[PDB]
């Protein structure tokens, strides 16, 4: 029922994290778009400047929300439904430990999950699906959306 009115989308990174170098964070998001763009005709373009539909940034406990973060563990990130404005945004916890290795919460795992919500997908009951409510580490060497997620995204965007 909920979906973007166009396959063209843009995004902008407000800032990186001192936890890892900027290059490590940049390739992390690029891999996320590739995995989702592999089974979707969506086009993602990075904007050097200006406001983008999906802006990614790292926040801290209190930052202007009715229910901010609960500390290190808990909300690893959050986003609002899609919309021609603030919606479609995505915030990450800066108080947590972001690493590209298998430690704490992998940035790629949370990143792929928030995009799923922006695509109009709801939490799935499959533990192998990225939309699973519980955080789980997976081998990004060749991970691909399972049949459950592929059937759902295809049914929405076709
Ligand atoms: C692999 O991707 C993700 C993305 C978000 C989260 S999460 O902690 O924000 N998370 C799910 C959750 C986690 C562990 C125990 N209970 C619930 C949530 C929590 C804690 C509170 C409210 C919403 C979510 C949510 O689903 N956001 O997408 C966990 C894993
Ligand atoms: Ca948290
Ligand atoms: Zn926030
Ligand atoms: Zn979720």
The Å distance, Cα 133 to ligand 1 centre, comes to: 5
Q: Does residue 32 have its Cβ closer than 6 Å to ligand 1?
A: no
Transcribe 71-125 into DSSP letters.
SSSS-SEEE----SSSTT-EEEESSS-EESSSSSEEHHHHHHHHHHHHTTPPPPS
Tell me how crowded residue 153 is: count the other CB atoms within 10 A of its CB: 20
Alpha helices in the chain (DSSP H): 22-38, 107-118, 147-157
Q: Does residue 109 have its Cβ closer than 6 Å to ligand 1?
A: yes
Provide the experimental method for this PDB entry: NMR
Among residues 148, 153, 85, 83, which one has the least CA distance to residue 116? 153
Of 76, 78, 138, the one to substitute when testing ligand 1's pocket (max ligand atoms within 8 A of C-beta) is 76
Round to whole Å and give the CA distance between 97 and 80.
Answer: 23
Listed in sequence order, the residues at least 6 apart from 148 whose beta carbon sits closer than 8 Å to its beta carbon are: 124, 126, 128, 129
* Adjacent-strand bridge partners of 78: 91
Residue ranges and CATH numbers for the domains of the chain are 1-158 (3.40.390.10)
127 with 101: CB under 8 angstroms? Answer: no
Radius of gyration of the chain (CA): 15
Tell me how crowded residue 125 is: count the other CB atoms within 10 A of its CB: 9
Residue 153 has which token pair? 């995204």
The Å distance, Cα 33 to ligand 2 centre, comes to: 24
């Amino acid at each position: 029922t909920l979906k973007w009115s166009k396959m063209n989308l843009t995004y902008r990174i407000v800032n990186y994290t001192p936890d890892m170098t900027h290059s490590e964070v940049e390739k992390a998001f690029k891999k996320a778009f590739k995995v989702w763009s592999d089974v979707t005709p969506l086009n993602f373009t990075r904007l050097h400047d200006g406001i983008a539909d999906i802006m990614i940034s790292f926040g801290i406990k209190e930052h202007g929300d009715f229910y901010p973060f609960d500390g290190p563990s808990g909300l690893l990130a959050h986003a609002f439904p899609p919309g021609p404005n603030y919606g479609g945004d995505a915030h990450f916890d800066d108080d947590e430990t972001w690493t590209s290795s298998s430690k704490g919460y992998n940035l790629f795992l949370v990143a792929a999950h928030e995009f799923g919500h922006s695509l109009g997908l709801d939490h799935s009951k499959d533990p192998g699906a990225l939309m699973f409510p519980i955080y789980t580490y997976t081998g990004k060497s060749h991970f691909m959306l399972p049949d459950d997620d592929v059937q759902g995204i295809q049914s929405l965007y076709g």
